Ligand binder design. Structure first.
Ligand SMILES: CCCCCCCCCCCCCCCCC[C@@H](O)O[C@H](CO[C@H](O)CCCCCCCCCCCCCCC)COP(=O)(O)OCC[N+](C)(C)C
Lengths: 175, 69
């Protein structure tokens, strides 16, 4: 339905064929479907209608919490505990959001593999490539930090990688 | 439950900031005090570690029965 964003959770246009009977025999599946409909789906729908009638009477909402952007750990001087505290809390919240991004991408991948049936190896390549890009980025940022991770250790990992990349590019320029 | 038993995150956040400031000030004060004690014990110029010497008020500055003291 419209409850969730179809841009973050997309799906193809859902092509389904029309029934083309070839025999005089009655299809027991469709009769069972009519029986199921008129014994199960209608009482359940009525119950839900009443429940939502009672819901509409008392309507209240909640709001997603928004967080400002505070200075990160790079612009905190070495022993300033308050800047360090706020930077570390911000880094932790960002780590949580990145975990959820990888989760969304993995959900897409799984849904594609199930949906595409026998053709998943070709029809889910974009989902696989998207996951590969996200996984590579997430791995660079947080892998090998260990328990007792922190923004300072993430910064040290990034700086080590940046040094290696700079030196590699410099010796490639001499080639 | 949140309304009856708990508070918002800002209270715990800023209480943590206060706690952290107190603790960090105490830590730097402890280190500085150790350094001050080291210097005062090595040099003896500070108020601390003052070892008694003889009171100059005990000396008798009167003619001493011979001219050369
Ligand atoms: C609606 C029905 C379906 C859902 C049921 C919901 C289940 C909830 C009931 C379970 C009880 C919760 C356990 C109590 C733990 C909370 C303890 C503490 O955190 O609560 C204090 C608050 O005190 C509460 O009153 C807790 C007291 C609960 C004591 C339980 C005793 C029950 C024993 C049952 C005896 C019944 C009779 C016995 C006959 C012999 C908080 O202190 P406070 O300083 O405010 O903090 C500031 C927060 N402010 C700003 C919001 C005010």
């Amino acid at each position: 339905p419209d409850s969730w964003d179809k841009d973050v959770y997309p799906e193809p246009p859902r092509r389904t064929p029309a029934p083309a009977p070839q025999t005089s025999l009655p299809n027991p599946v469709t009769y069972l479907t009519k029986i199921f409909d008129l014994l199960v789906d209608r009482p359940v729908t009525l119950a839900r209608e009443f429940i939502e009638q009672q819901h509409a009477k008392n309507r209240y909402y909640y709001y997603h919490r928004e967080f400002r952007r505070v200075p990160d750990i790079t612009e905190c001087e070495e022993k300033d505990i308050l800047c360090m505290f706020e930077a570390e809390m911000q880094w932790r919240r960002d780590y949580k959001v990145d975990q959820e991004i990888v989760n969304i991408i993995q959900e897409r991948l799984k849904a594609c593999q199930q949906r595409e049936g026998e053709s998943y190896r070709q029809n889910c390549a974009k989902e696989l490539e998207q996951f590969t890009q996200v996984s590579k980025a997430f791995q660079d940022r947080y892998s090998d930090l260990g328990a007792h991770y922190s923004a300072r250790k993430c910064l040290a990992k990034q700086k080590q990688r940046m040094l290696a990349e700079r030196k590699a590019a410099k010796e490639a320029a001499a080639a | 439950i949140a309304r009856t038993f708990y508070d918002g995150p800002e209270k715990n956040y800023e209480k943590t900031m206060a706690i952290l400031q107190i603790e960090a000030e105490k830590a730097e004060l402890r280190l500085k005090e150790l350094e001050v004690r080291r210097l005062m014990r090595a040099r003896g110029d500070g108020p601390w570690y003052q070892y008694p010497t003889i009171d100059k008020a005990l000396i008798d500055h009167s003619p001493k029965t011979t001219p050369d003291n």
